[PDB]
Amino acid sequence: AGADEERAETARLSSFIGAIAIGDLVKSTLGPKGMDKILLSSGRDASLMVTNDGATILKNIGVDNPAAKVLVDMSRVQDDEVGDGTTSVTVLAAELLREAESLIAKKIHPQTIIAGWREATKAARQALLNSAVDHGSDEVKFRQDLMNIAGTTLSSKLLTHHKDHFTKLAVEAVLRLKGSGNLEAIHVIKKLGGSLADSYLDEGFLLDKKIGVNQPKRIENAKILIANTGMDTDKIKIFGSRVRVDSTAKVAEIEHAEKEKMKEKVERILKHGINCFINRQLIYNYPEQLFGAAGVMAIEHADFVGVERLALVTGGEIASTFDHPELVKLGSCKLIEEVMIGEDKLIHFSGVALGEACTIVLRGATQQILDEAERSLHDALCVLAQTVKDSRTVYGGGCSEMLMAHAVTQLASRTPGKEAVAMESYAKALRMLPTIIADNAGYDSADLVAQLRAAHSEGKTTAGLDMKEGTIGDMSVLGITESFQVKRQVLLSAAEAAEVILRVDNIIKAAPR
Amino acid sequence: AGADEERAETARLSSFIGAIAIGDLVKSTLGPKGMDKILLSSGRDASLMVTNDGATILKNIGVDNPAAKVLVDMSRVQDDEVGDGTTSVTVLAAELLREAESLIAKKIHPQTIIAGWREATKAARQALLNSAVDHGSDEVKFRQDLMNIAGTTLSSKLLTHHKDHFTKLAVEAVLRLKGSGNLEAIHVIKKLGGSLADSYLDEGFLLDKKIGVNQPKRIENAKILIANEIEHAEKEKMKEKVERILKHGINCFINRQLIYNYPEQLFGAAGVMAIEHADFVGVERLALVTGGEIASTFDHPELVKLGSCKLIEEVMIGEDKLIHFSGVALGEACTIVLRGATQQILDEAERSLHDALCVLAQTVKDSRTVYGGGCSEMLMAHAVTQLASRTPGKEAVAMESYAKALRMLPTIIADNAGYDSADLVAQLRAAHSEGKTTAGLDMKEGTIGDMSVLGITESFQVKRQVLLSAAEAAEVILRVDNIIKAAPR
Amino acid sequence: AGADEERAETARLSSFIGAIAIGDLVKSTLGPKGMDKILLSSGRDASLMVTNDGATILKNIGVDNPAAKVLVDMSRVQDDEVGDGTTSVTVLAAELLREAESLIAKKIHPQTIIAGWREATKAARQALLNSAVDHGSDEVKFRQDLMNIAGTTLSSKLLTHHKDHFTKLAVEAVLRLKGSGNLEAIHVIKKLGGSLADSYLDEGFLLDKKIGVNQPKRIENAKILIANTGKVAEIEHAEKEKMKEKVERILKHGINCFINRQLIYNYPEQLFGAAGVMAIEHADFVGVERLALVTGGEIASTFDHPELVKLGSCKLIEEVMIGEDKLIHFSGVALGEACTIVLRGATQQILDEAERSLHDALCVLAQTVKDSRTVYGGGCSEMLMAHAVTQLASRTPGKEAVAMESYAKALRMLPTIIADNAGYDSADLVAQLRAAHSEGKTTAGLDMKEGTIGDMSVLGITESFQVKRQVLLSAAEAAEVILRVDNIIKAAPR
Amino acid sequence: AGADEERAETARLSSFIGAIAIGDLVKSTLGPKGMDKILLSSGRDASLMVTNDGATILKNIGVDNPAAKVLVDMSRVQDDEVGDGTTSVTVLAAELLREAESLIAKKIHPQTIIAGWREATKAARQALLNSAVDHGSDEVKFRQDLMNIAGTTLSSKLLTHHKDHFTKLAVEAVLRLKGSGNLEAIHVIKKLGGSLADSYLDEGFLLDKKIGVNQPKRIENAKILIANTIEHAEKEKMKEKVERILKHGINCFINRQLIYNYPEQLFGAAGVMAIEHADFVGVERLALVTGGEIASTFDHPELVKLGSCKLIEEVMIGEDKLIHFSGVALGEACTIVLRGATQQILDEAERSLHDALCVLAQTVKDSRTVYGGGCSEMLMAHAVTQLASRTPGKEAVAMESYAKALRMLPTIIADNAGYDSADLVAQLRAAHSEGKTTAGLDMKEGTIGDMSVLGITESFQVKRQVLLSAAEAAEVILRVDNIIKAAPR
């Protein structure tokens, strides 16, 4: 229905603007020294969200009328099977649109010009088939656990002054996460406190809640209880109305009935040896006095998301009415205690025998810049899982992009008529990436492009863009690598719909309405 | 990736503006001629708040959209580590920003410039291991007890004309408080009735409050009580209080909260003085002093209560109504009562004692100090200026910008003095360059003098943490564009 | 009034806008189906200037507030040593400005980038003497003399249907032109039309004036006279004496024609008709200047001026029927140093293109003699250079490369433009064009009649070698002045 | 009547704005990689002039309400004395205004800072002490005649791809000039044609006028006549001209004004070439060249006239006809003609050339120069930082700020080069600090190199008064709210 009318030229233009606007923000993000973008919104979110991951912020927000959301949505599928590394895929697609302005001069058949996607099928071929990636990544592995690909993802991120160490920590997390058991139950939070480590590794799941001022400080061989239904009692489905009774004698039983709820909770809780209770909602006051005497620590209004992960962690339980204790519930038993961390007080669940689920706690300076660690971390978890079993990678720092560009230029001219025009335009698309990496490093982009091309042309796939250097250097020494799937999936997506429809290269434009 | 957006140079300006606004308000705060600031704002605050301490005022309010609050929060961690000293750390960070106007001339990636912070680390340790300055503070101590750091914290506040004598007194308070346990039993009030001595020292505890208009004027052999059918029930509650009370001879009751009206009538007829809403901080202190009490329900009287009976009375000192607890047998905890000349500077004395207890605990443990009055700042500034020219590429514009930031502290210290700031900067630099570590800014002088003779010294913990913290403050400028919130609209 | 405050980005923008507006107008002017532009202004402009030659109209006027008059001025110096072919220099300079938006993206300093133009100048020269071409233009040359560049230069002009023939004629003019003097004394005027030939070549100078309807139709063994200077009864008698002096001196000489650059007195007019002598009133001074070198000239004084003090060439002077209209012919000059070129046309006031097409035409083949060097036409040169220049950007150490590569892709538009107007799809054309050029055959080019690609040499199209060397050096620098200048100091009442 | 209202601080701003507006156009111009600008205007202006010399363009126009024209006017006194080389004097004065924003922050006495100018004079000697000038320029000078300052003057001008060769030519022009009388008898015109040399040096004077269509093409053993000035009477003027003229053998006549038609017919038959409306300035120079003559009424022929004869002819050069006067016996006065590669930038030659004539003459007379490429400026910068610490009171703050001003110049010279500015600044500082006055910014290299090997040096005078002018301009805009003077050209 209604509003927003666009056709042919004007409609093509809307696609054009969306690609250029996104490219500049993502432009600072790529390579060993990127920049931080900080966002504040109104009416649906709490505060300032800062993300160095182009994928994370894009998924969350659809700011305006121009089209770009659908292109953005696709990158997530990429994350599930490979994703990140560094966010470069969005940039390649955007630059495709710049050539379109020179096409109107031609003024006849973009479709004839378009001969290129079949030609760009070649990109699926040339970009990720020539150059020997990586191989072993044995298992657990001493030295090769990190100090390579995680570091590159982080280098593009500003926090590398101390976060390079954080990245190193993440693979330790993946080692426990490898084997059989699914990609689930990984929890991470950041703490407002400065230390050299800037992060702490827990033996289990971290939660931030307390029963009250009273109750024992620490429990051992802990039994964990999770209830779906609240502790609160009174109304029931049918009120039974608020009653009055024939004398003061029968009003007493009602108060007495309250005591019975108290009775059930302690009598069978004691047999279990219950050390901790976690409830996701409001908690009734009566049990609270009881738990302190028993020596049981309960958690008021515990977050549901923490709870679901916790069930996987402790073998779980079936949560229903107060019958829920004993056998229906399973409780792991290493150590549960509330421990002060840097400055804040946190409760630590640890020693889960099953081992499938684990939690990582980050620590920091207390800056917005610190919130950067949250954005980088999310990026890192996805990067390592894919690196371990994809058994395939490419040289980073734009090494791959310059090589393909040299190869694609040859393709133009070699093909005779009709075929040649789009293939060269596709070819120039590789050139902007070298420019994007250099500009964010504070070095003159013009000077950098010229010197960059000569090293790639020579045949060293290892050589690439070194931002700290300001010129060109050996990418491999740095340990900068991109996963094979991230590069492979994007080229097909760019040349997917593009092929068959207007069957060839220089896409999209609008259709009906 | 958008919100409220400004890019590179405009983005830089939002951080740039926040630092300059804070520096001017805080500059007048520092040293002997510093001045008190008062704030008034609409809704959810009341009216006049006056905070001499820069840290306390910044923490309380997030006034506007431009970023600065996160930078503000960090000073508190520093406060916990050692505390106040003199407020100077916020100021260094602000002047760092002015150089950034010239960083556009550098013309490269600002993150790349950030290497200067590492360079700042060189500045951080140049200050360190150069000029050992202190050895001492064994415990109690005959002559090193004061005329030192307490005097410098007090230097910031104009009370120093007679106050420095009072601050000498404060370490005596600390010596009694370092042992036995806690950080309790210290209370300070001011009275109007000026004399040269300006302070006494109460062995007991001093409190300002009254039961009500009725009740006996004075109590002797005083005993102290401290406490942590419906219609019919209330009468019994009254009755239990009187029955237990009469046998004891109960002279005074102190309760840390609101007090129910029924008992009030009974206390008047009985001849018992009670205190409504007594502050908790005073109450804990009283317990150590009186031998303590077991505070619980109305069973609290007799044996579970230990009472000190020298004398409790409401005493007129000078003018204002106050109640004096004295004659404590323990002697471990005391209250210092200082008499002033009747000015805000008299209220100024309130924060001088707080400042003194904290220093000695930290000063004994660190075993290190630095010269105060900006002595360290010019010396460090002299060392840092050389570093900028020496370092290549990226480092040189950034290195001197941090070095430059040391210069304002000398300027801030004397601007509030009443002397011309421009003249002060040149003269200061010449003495530090020459090689005298002891030499520093003398505000009373208007020029430079020997800091050690004053006795002004600064705790080692305040200096090490600020420099690492400062780097983070300089670390949140240009790289961050806008990005507003922490507290409701 | 005082106003118009602009700085930094806004000042750059004024430069940006001037380049974009000009490029669209000059855009269809390149190649076989170029578009006719007609432009008029009040005052002394006159009437008919319809401009297909981009350089000619731009040079003539400076109509509006934005700054671009100076960039336009620069193209003419190029024109004097070579100029045209097709007007492409302005287009290439204009497209460079688009990257200026990316300059703020580079966010450092624009001056570092402009050094690329110097480099571009080197790029211009390394795109000149390497990556070969035709190696023809021996001298005189019976078949390669034309039907070449002019055909392509003419291609941008509509009149190509009968004008391509005209174009062939123009090199004959250069063959006589080459030698002792320089590029001097060449005059050409269109005379609408009505003949298959569409042009007659005059062995001498062309003139267009008549004394009056009466007077002898033809003169032979003609002596030419050019003069700088234009009892009451005896006064009347004295007038007769002026008549007498003019006749007495005239008959002995045999004077066949008189030409004067000013008003002529009525009394002598009757005399000339009876004698058998034709006179010209208010003949243009410029025509006379050209004529003096040609005929050996004379000394122009008072009536003593006839006989020996004046020299009169005597081949043939006549008024002849040219297709339809009458135009005077001065011809058969012994010296041979200076000549006159005459052309015609279909007549749609698009023929007037020939008035300025010709201005570009005049310089190009005169130049061809001097160069003894030429390049393949039909855009053959542009595709070859484009293939070579793409490699060249990486060949340079840096700085040079960024500007050189952008410059390289600029060449792509010209092949597109040549076939775009041709009535064929540009997209198919650009790809097929490159394959033949990359192959190694320099003779391959845009075959516009064909609609595809073919042997340019077979068609017979070549461009003056100078047009390519100067244009490349000139284009980069003409482009540089608008981009490098941020903030032009002014004051604009308007 | 009333539209714009300004007071004190905003008044400073109007003055502030003028310095920034001028600085952006001028900065591009400075150093070996500068730019050229074109101005249209209207009324009493023939056509747009494009000026590279900051001094020439500012003198010629007073475009708007803000006051800057007077600041501009002073630079010319500097130019007659020396001036040029590169226009940097105006830029440096402009950058001192930026500190003024800092100054309101100071919030004290604005003129207290004014002491810094006195200090600036101290700063000026500071460069002299800390840089090695030159050891020679003893007249004529076999290799150091050029390939130094002219190269720097010209390098700032892009045209140096081929024009560096013409820059070399200009000193030869000054060497003949040095001697007996002031700055006169030098004529130079650009020509629209292409050649490798890009210019020709003429021993005589070049002119561009023609008698008429008729008249002999060429004259030899030429006699030259210069003039400062019913029907039957007209014939007599014709008679005197021919009779007297024939005896002398008269080959050419040059008249500075309109010429009567009757003689024109005579000259053609006689075989004499005359010039109508010849420019007086060309004539005066020509007279010195040919030995001159006494110009009066028609009694002017014979001995009162002295004519030199080598060759006078009209020659085709490129596309435009000009007349060449050549073979002067005196040799004292000469004319320079330059061609080059054409465009807008060739009208530039009239502009660039004016600058060239001024720099080279100075080089022979001064016998003093300093190393170019910014070598002088960085070394002064290393030197400037130490002095500020030493100077008492007012002087330290102002001397240091003046001192860091010099840092930007290395950055601007490098920036136009086309190389990374950040890397360049620090490396430059290291070479100067060591003690090599020769080392400087090698823009072509992209890094620091030995300036002396290049051969580039700057005239000593340009440096002496730039510092003094910069200081008066630096005394600046802060002073008076209105300045104005003159009605030029």
Q: Domain of A284: which CATH number?
A: 3.50.7.10
Give the Å distances, CA to CA, from D312 to A408, D218, D326, D327, D329.
65, 7, 6, 9, 14
Task: Return the ∠ at Cα B160 (arms to B155 and B164), rounded to 5°.
Answer: 95
The answer to whether the CB atoms of D389 and B101 lie below 8 A apart is no
Length of chain A: 513
Amino acid at C424: Y
Q: CA-CA distances (angstroms) from residue C372 to A202, C79, C176, C178, D32?
A: 85, 18, 15, 11, 38
Q: Long-range pairs for A147-151 at CB < 8 Å and ≥24 separation?
A: A147/A479, A148/A479, A148/A481, A149/A85, A149/A383, A149/A384, A149/A387, A149/A393, A149/A479, A149/A480, A149/A481, A149/A483, A150/A380, A150/A383, A150/A384, A151/A479, A151/A480
* Tokens of residue A90, six digits: 């969005």
Q: CB count, 10 Å around CB of D48? A: 18
Per-residue H/E/C for A278-336: EECCCCCHHHHHHHHHHCCEEECCCCHHHHHHHHHHHCCECCCCCCCCHHHECCCCCEE
CA distance B475 to D201: 62
Instruction: Indicate if A233 and A348 belong to the same structural domain.
Output: yes
Maximum distance among all alpha carbons in chain C?
Answer: 96
Question: Which residue type does D484 have?
Answer: I
Q: With contacts defined as CB-CB under 8 Å, which chain B residues touch A36?
A: 479-480
Whole-angstrom distance, CA of residue C467 vs CA of residue C469 = 6
Tokens of A187: 């929890």
The Cα A167–Cα A379 span in angstroms is 10
Tell me the three state secondary structure of residue A416. coil
Q: Which residues contact A80 (CB under 8 A, 6 or more apart)?
A: none
Nearest in space to C281 (alpha carbons), one of C268, C267, C262, C266: C262
Structure tokens, D143:
């290799």
Q: Are the beta carbons of C113 and A446 separated by less than 8 Å? A: yes
How far is C-alpha A307 from the chain's CA centre? 21
CA atoms within 13 A on the CB side of B441: 34
Show which of A331, A355, A379 is a domain's final residue: A355
Instruction: Compute, in degrees rounded to 10, the torsion defined by CA atoms D445, D448, D454, D459.
Output: 130
Q: Which residues of D sit in the known binding site for ATP?
A: 31, 85-87, 458, 463
Q: Which helix (H) or strand (E) holds B117?
A: helix B115-127
**CA–CA separation, B199 vs B171, rounded Å?**
14
Distance from CA of D268 to the nearest CA of C (A): 7
Contact assessment for residue B218 and residue B236, using Cβ atoms and an 8 Å cutoff = no
Contact of D418 with chain A, judged by CB distance below 8 Å, is answered with yes
Q: Are A427 and A455 in contact (CB under 8 A)?
A: no
Query: Within 10 A of A481 (CB to CB), how many other CB atoms are there?
Result: 24
Q: Which residues pair with B441 in a beta bridge?
A: B448
Catalytic residue positions of C, numbered: 53, 86-87, 360
Verify that C188 and C225 share a domain, yes or no.
no
SS3 B463: helix
Residues of B in contact with D390 (CB under 8 A): 430
For the question of residue D355 being annotated catalytic, the response is yes
CA distance C479 to C483: 7
Residue in chain C lying closest to A444 (CA): C106
Annotated binding-site residues of A for Mg(2+) read 84
Compute the nearest-CA separation of C8 from chain B (Å): 14
Q: How far apart are the first and last CA of chain C?
A: 10
Q: Which residues of C touch D344 (CB under 8 A)?
A: 70-71, 73-74, 478, 481
The answer to whether residues D196 and D338 belong to one domain is yes
Scan residues 456-475 of A and list those with Cβ closer than 8 Å to D.
Answer: 470
- Taking CB atoms within 8 Å and a gap of at least 24, the contacts of C213-217 are C214/C273, C215/C272, C215/C273, C215/C277, C215/C278, C215/C279, C216/C273, C216/C276, C216/C277, C216/C278, C217/C318, C217/C319
Please say whether the beta carbons of A402 and A416 come within 8 A: no
Quick one: C337 exposed, middle or buried, by C-beta within 10 A (0-12, 13-18, 19+)?
Answer: middle
Our measurement of the distance from residue D266's CA atom to the centroid of its chain's CA atoms, rounded to an integer in Å, reads 44
Q: Is the dihedral of CA B13, B19, B22, B26 positive or negative?
A: negative
Q: How many CB pairs below 8 Å do chains B and D form together? A: 77
Three-class DSSP labels, A359-377: EEEEEECCCCCCHHHHHHH
CB D180 within 8 A of CB D332: yes
Q: How many CB pairs under 8 A join C and D?
A: 118
CA distance B485 to chain A (A): 6
Judging contacts by C-beta atoms under 8 Å, the chain B residues touching residue D420 are 108
Residues D301 and D307: their CA atoms lie apart, in Å, by 10
Residue A177 parent element (H or E): helix A160-177
The number of distinct structural domains making up chain B is 3
Calpha distance D339→D357 (Å, rounded): 17
Are C74 and C478 a contacting pair, CB within 8 Å?
Answer: yes
A72 close contact with B: CB closer than 8 A: no
C287 neighbors C297 (Cβ within 8 angstroms): no
| CATH code: domain of residue A365 | 3.30.260.10
Residue B144, SS3 per DSSP? coil
Residue D87 annotated to the active site: yes
Alpha-carbon distance C102 to nearest alpha carbon in chain A (angstroms) = 11
The DSSP output letter for B356 is H
Structural element, H or E, at residue C340:
strand C340-343
Distance from CA of A22 to the nearest CA of B (A): 8
**Do residues B149 and B457 lie in contact, with contact meaning Cβ atoms separated by under 8 Å?**
yes
Return the residue matching tokens 């990496």: A437
Q: What is the DSSP letter of B17?
A: H
Strand partners, D227: D255
Q: Tokens representing D425? A: 């600044």
Measured CA angle at D62 (ends D61, D64), to 5 deg: 135
**Nearest 5°: phi and psi at A105?**
-60, -40
> DSSP 3-state assignment of B107?
coil
My answer on whether A213 and A340 are in the same domain is yes
Are B375 and B303 part of one and the same domain? no
In which residue are the tokens 């130094």 written? Answer: D148
CB within 8 Å: C111 and D194: no
What is the 8-class DSSP label of residue C35?
Answer: P
Please name the chains neighbouring D, where neighbouring means 3+ C-beta pairs under 8 angstroms: A, B, C
Nearest one of A376, A380, A491, A488 to A426, comparing CA atoms: A491
Residue B104: other Cβ atoms inside 10 A: 13
Resolution of the deposited coordinates, in angstroms? Answer: 11.3
Indicate yes or no: CB of B392 within 8 angstroms of CB of D102: no
CA distances from A109 to A182, A420, B216 (A): 51, 14, 107
- Of B412, B402, B398, the C-alpha closest to B380 is B402
> Are both A23 and A149 inside the same structural domain?
no
Residues 6+ apart with CB under 8 A from B319: B191, B192, B193
Two structure tokens written together for B398: 């950034």
For residues C66 and C181, state if they share a domain. no
Gyration radius (Cα) of chain C, Å: 27
Are residue A6 and residue A19 in the same domain, yes or no?
yes
How would you write chain D as a 3-class SS string? CCCCCCCHHHHHHHHHHHHHHHHHHHHHHCCCCCCCEEECCCCCCCCCEEECCHHHHHHHCCCCCCCCHHHHHHHHHHHHHCCCCCCCHHHHHHHCCCHHHHHHHHCCCHHHHCHHHHHHHHHHHHHHHCCCCCCCCCCCCCCCCCCCHHHHHHHCCCCHHHHHHHHHHHHHHHHHHCCCCCCCCEEEEECCCCCCCCEEEECCCEECCCCCCCCCCEEECCCEEEECCCHHHHHHHHHHHHHHHHHHCCCEEEECCCCCHHHHHHHHHHCCEEECCCCHHHHHHHHHHHCCECCCCCCCCHHHECCCCCEEEEEEECCEEEEEEECCCCCCCEEEEECCCCCHHHCHHHHHHHHHHHHHHHHHHHCCEEECCCHHHHHHHHHHHHHHHHCCCHHHHHHHHHHHHHHHHHHHHHHHHCCCHHHHHHHHHHHHHHCCCCEEEECCCCEEEEHHHHCCEEEHHHHHHHHHHHHHHHHCCCCCCCCCCCCCC
Residue of B396, C127, B50 lying closest to D426 (CA atoms): B396
Same domain, B104 and B156: no
Mark whether B241 and B314 lie in a shared domain.
yes
Q: Are C179 and C172 within 8 A, CB to CB?
A: no
Nearest to D193 by CA among C470, C356, C481: C470
DSSP 8-state symbol, C307: G
Within chain A, how many helices (H) and strands (E) appear?
A: 18, 16
**With an 8 Å Cβ cutoff, are B101 and D98 in contact?**
yes
Q: What share of chain A is helix, strand, coil (3-state, %, to 5)?
A: 45, 15, 40
For residues C162 and C169, give the distance between their C-alpha atoms in angstroms, rounded to a whole number.
Answer: 12
Q: What is the torsional sign of CA A421, A424, A429, A432? A: negative
Q: Which of B2, B109, B472 sits opposite A442 (nearest CB)?
A: B109
With H, G, I as helix, E, B as strand and everything else as coil, classify residue B156.
Answer: coil
Q: Binding site: residue ranges of D?
A: 31, 84-88, 155-156, 373, 458, 463
- Residues of chain A with Cβ-Cβ distance to C387 below 8 Å are 413
D8: its two tokens:
């004190």
The DSSP code sequence of A470-501 is: TEEEEHHHHT-EEEHHHHHHHHHHHTTTTTTG
Residue A355 CB contacts under 8 Å (≥ 6 apart), including other chains = A176, A181
Alpha-carbon distances, residue C358 vs B217, C167, C474 (angstroms):
124, 9, 22
The sheet with strand B205-207 has its strands ordered as B205-207, B321-326, B311-316, B218-219
CA pair distance B446, B444, nearest whole angstrom: 6
Last residue of a domain, one of A329, A355, A381: A355
Domain boundary (A366, A391, A416) is at A391
C416 Cβ neighbours under 8 A, 6+ residues apart: A105, A106, C426, C429, C430
Q: How far apart are CA C125 and CA C121, in angstroms?
A: 6
Within 10 A of B151 (CB to CB), how many other CB atoms are there?
A: 24
- By three-state DSSP, how is residue B70 classified? helix
Nearest CA in chain D to B432: D389
- On chain B, the residues whose CB falls within 8 A of the CB of A50 are 483
H-run or E-run covering B197 = none
Question: Which residues of chain C come before a gap where C and the next N are over 2.5 Å apart?
Answer: 230
Segments in B249-343 forming alpha helices (H):
261-270, 280-290
Residues D216 and D326 in one domain: yes
Cross-chain CB nearest to B1 (options A39, A366, A369): A39
**Interchain proximity A40–B3, CB inside 8 Å:** yes
In this structure, which amino acid lies at residue C179? G
Nearest residue to D413 via CA among C111, C400, B103: C111
By the CB < 8 Å criterion, does C390 face chain A? yes
Are B140 and B115 members of one domain?
Answer: no
What residue numbers bound the domain in which C51 lies? Answer: 1-133+373-494
Q: Is C125 an 8 Å CB contact of chain D?
A: no
Name residue, tokens 């409190």: B207
Q: Which residues are within 8 A (CB) of B43 and not within 5 positions of it... i.e. 6 or more apart?
A: none
Of B3, B67, B479, nearest to A158 by CB-CB distance is: B479
Is residue D229 part of the annotated active site? The answer reads no
d(C-alpha C227, C-alpha C225), whole Å: 7
Q: What are phi and psi of A333, to 5 degrees?
A: -135, 50
Residue A415 DSSP one-character state: S
H or E element in which residue A60 lies: helix A54-60
DSSP A430-474: HHHHHHHHHHTTTS-HHHHHHHHHHHHHHT-SSEEEETTTTEEEE
Residues in D closer than 8 angstroms to B430, CB to CB, are: 389-390, 392, 396
Report residue C431 as tokens. 């790809």
| CA-CA-CA-CA dihedral for A133, A138, A139, A140, to nearest 10 | -80
**Dihedral (Cα; A365, A366, A371, A377), 10-degree rounding:** 40
Chain B residues within 8 A of A22 when measuring between CB atoms: 1
Whole-number Å distance between alpha carbons of C393 and C403: 8
List C-alpha distances in Å: A84 to A173, A439, D427: 18, 21, 39
Q: Which amino acid is at C342?
A: V
